[PDB]
PDB file of C-alpha atoms in Angstrom:
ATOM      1  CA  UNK A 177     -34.105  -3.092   1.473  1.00  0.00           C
ATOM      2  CA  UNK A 178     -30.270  -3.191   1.291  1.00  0.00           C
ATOM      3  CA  UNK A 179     -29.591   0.653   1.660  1.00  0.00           C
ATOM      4  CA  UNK A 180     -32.130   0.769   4.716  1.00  0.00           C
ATOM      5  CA  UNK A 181     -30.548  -2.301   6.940  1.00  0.00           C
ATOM      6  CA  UNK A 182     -26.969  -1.239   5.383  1.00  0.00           C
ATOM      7  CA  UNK A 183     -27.911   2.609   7.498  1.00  0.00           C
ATOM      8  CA  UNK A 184     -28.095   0.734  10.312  1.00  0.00           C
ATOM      9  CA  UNK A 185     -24.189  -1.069  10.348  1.00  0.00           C
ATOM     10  CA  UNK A 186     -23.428   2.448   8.951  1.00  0.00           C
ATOM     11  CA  UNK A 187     -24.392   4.334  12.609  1.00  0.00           C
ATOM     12  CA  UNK A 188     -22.464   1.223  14.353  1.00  0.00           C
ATOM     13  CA  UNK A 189     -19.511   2.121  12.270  1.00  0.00           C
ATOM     14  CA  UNK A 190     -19.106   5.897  13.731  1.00  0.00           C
ATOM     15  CA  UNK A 191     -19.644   3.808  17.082  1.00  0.00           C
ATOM     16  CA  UNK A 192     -17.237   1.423  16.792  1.00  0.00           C
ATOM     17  CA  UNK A 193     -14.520   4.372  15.224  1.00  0.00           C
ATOM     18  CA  UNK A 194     -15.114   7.232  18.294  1.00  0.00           C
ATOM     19  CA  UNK A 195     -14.828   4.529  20.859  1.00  0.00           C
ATOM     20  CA  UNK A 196     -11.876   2.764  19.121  1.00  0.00           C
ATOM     21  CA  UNK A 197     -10.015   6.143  18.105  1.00  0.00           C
ATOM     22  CA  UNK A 198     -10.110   6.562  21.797  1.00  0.00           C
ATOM     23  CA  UNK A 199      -8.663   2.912  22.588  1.00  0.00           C
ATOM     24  CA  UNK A 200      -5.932   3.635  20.706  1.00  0.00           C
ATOM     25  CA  UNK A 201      -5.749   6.861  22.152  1.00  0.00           C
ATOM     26  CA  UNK A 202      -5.080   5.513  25.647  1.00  0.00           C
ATOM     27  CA  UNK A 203      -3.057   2.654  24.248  1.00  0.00           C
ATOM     28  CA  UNK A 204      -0.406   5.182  22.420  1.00  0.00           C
ATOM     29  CA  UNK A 205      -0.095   6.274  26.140  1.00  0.00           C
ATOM     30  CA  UNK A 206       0.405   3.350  27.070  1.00  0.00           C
ATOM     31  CA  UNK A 207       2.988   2.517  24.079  1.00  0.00           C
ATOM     32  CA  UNK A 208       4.698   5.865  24.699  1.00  0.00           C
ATOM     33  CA  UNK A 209       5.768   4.714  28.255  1.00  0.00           C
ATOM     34  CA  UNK A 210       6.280   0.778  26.338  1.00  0.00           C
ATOM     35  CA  UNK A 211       9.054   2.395  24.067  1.00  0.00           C
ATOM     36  CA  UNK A 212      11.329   3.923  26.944  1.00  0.00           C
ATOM     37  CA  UNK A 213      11.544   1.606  29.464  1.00  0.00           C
ATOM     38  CA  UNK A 214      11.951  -1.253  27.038  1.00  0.00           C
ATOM     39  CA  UNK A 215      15.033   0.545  25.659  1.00  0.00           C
ATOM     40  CA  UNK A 216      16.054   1.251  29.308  1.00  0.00           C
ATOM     41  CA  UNK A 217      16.245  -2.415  29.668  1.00  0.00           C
ATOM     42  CA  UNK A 218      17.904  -3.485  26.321  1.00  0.00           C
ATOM     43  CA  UNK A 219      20.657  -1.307  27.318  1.00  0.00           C
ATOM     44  CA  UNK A 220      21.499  -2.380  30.849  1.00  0.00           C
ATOM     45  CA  UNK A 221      21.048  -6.500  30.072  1.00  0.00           C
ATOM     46  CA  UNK A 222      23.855  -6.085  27.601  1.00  0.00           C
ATOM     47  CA  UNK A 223      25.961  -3.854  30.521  1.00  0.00           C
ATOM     48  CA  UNK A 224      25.665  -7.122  32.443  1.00  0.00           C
ATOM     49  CA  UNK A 225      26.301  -9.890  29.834  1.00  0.00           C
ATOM     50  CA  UNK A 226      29.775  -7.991  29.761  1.00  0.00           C
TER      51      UNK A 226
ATOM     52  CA  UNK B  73     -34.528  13.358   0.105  1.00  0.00           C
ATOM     53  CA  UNK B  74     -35.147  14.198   3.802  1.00  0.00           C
ATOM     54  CA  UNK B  75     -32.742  11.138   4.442  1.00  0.00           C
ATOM     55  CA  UNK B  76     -30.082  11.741   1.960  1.00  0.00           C
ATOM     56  CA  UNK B  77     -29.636  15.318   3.381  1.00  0.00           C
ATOM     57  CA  UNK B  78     -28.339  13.780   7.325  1.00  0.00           C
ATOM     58  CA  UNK B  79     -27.099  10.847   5.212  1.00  0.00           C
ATOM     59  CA  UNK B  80     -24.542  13.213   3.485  1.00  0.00           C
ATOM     60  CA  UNK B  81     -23.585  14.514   6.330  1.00  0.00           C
ATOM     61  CA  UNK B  82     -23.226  10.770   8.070  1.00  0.00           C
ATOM     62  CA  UNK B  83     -21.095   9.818   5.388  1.00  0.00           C
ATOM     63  CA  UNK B  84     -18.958  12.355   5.840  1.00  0.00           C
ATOM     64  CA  UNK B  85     -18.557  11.792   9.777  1.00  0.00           C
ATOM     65  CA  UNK B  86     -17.505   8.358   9.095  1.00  0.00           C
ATOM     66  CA  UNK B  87     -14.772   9.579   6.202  1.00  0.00           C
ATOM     67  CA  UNK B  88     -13.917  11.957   9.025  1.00  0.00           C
ATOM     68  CA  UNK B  89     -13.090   8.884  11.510  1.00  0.00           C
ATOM     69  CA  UNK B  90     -11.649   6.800   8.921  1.00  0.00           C
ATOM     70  CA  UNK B  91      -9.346   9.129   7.783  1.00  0.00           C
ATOM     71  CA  UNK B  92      -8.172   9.694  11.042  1.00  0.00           C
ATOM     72  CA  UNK B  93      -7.882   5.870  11.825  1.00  0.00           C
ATOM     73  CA  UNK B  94      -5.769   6.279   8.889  1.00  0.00           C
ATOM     74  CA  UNK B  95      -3.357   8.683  10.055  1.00  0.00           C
ATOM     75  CA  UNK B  96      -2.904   6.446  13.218  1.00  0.00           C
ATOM     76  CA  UNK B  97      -3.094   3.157  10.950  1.00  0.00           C
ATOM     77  CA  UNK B  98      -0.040   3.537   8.991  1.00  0.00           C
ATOM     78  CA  UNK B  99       1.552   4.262  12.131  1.00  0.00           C
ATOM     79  CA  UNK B 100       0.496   1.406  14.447  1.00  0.00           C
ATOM     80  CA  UNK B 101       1.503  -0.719  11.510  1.00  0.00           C
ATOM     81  CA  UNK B 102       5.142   0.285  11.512  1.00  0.00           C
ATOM     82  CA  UNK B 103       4.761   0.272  15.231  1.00  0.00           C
ATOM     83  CA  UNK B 104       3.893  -3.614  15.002  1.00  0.00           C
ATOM     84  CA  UNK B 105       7.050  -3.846  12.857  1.00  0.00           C
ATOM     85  CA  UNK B 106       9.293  -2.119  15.394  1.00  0.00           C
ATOM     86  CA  UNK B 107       7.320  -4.038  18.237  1.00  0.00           C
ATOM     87  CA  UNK B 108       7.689  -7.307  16.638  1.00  0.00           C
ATOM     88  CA  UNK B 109      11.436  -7.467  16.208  1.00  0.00           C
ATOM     89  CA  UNK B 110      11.998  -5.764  19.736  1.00  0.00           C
ATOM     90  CA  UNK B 111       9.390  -8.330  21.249  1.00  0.00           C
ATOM     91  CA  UNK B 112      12.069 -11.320  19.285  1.00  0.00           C
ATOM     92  CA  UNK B 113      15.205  -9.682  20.237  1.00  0.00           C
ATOM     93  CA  UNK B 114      14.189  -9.361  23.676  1.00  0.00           C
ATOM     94  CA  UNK B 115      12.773 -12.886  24.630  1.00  0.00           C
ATOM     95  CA  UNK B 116      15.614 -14.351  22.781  1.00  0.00           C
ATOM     96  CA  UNK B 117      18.129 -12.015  25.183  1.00  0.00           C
ATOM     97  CA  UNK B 118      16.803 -13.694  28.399  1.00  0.00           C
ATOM     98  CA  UNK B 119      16.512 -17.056  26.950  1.00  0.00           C
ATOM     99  CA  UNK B 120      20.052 -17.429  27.629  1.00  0.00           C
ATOM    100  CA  UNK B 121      19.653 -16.988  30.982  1.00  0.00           C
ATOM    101  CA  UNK B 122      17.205 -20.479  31.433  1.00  0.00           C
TER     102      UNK B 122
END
């Protein structure tokens, strides 16, 4: 009884990881474009405080 | 037996995925690190400017 309802959360699981490998797929993306232009504007608000 | 077989084979999908995950996981989780300290630094740059 366990094993048989514990096969179903087991086919949700490989649900759940394809669709939230890709999530974080286009969310790296995302973060790769966060990490540069966050820099980009560290840099130039300390220019001005000068 | 005839379940075991696919089951075997399910099982290793989700170590697969989770594995992975993994690979990403570690990495996300120094990326909230670097994120959080950026995200504290920055806020506390413009709160100067109120």
């Amino acid at each position: 009884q366990a094993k048989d309802e514990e096969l179903q959360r087991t086919k949700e699981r490989q649900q759940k990881a394809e669709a939230e490998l890709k999530e974080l797929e286009q969310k790296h993306t995302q973060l790769c474009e966060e990490k540069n232009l966050l820099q980009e504007k560290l840099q130039a608000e300390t220019e001005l405080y000068a």
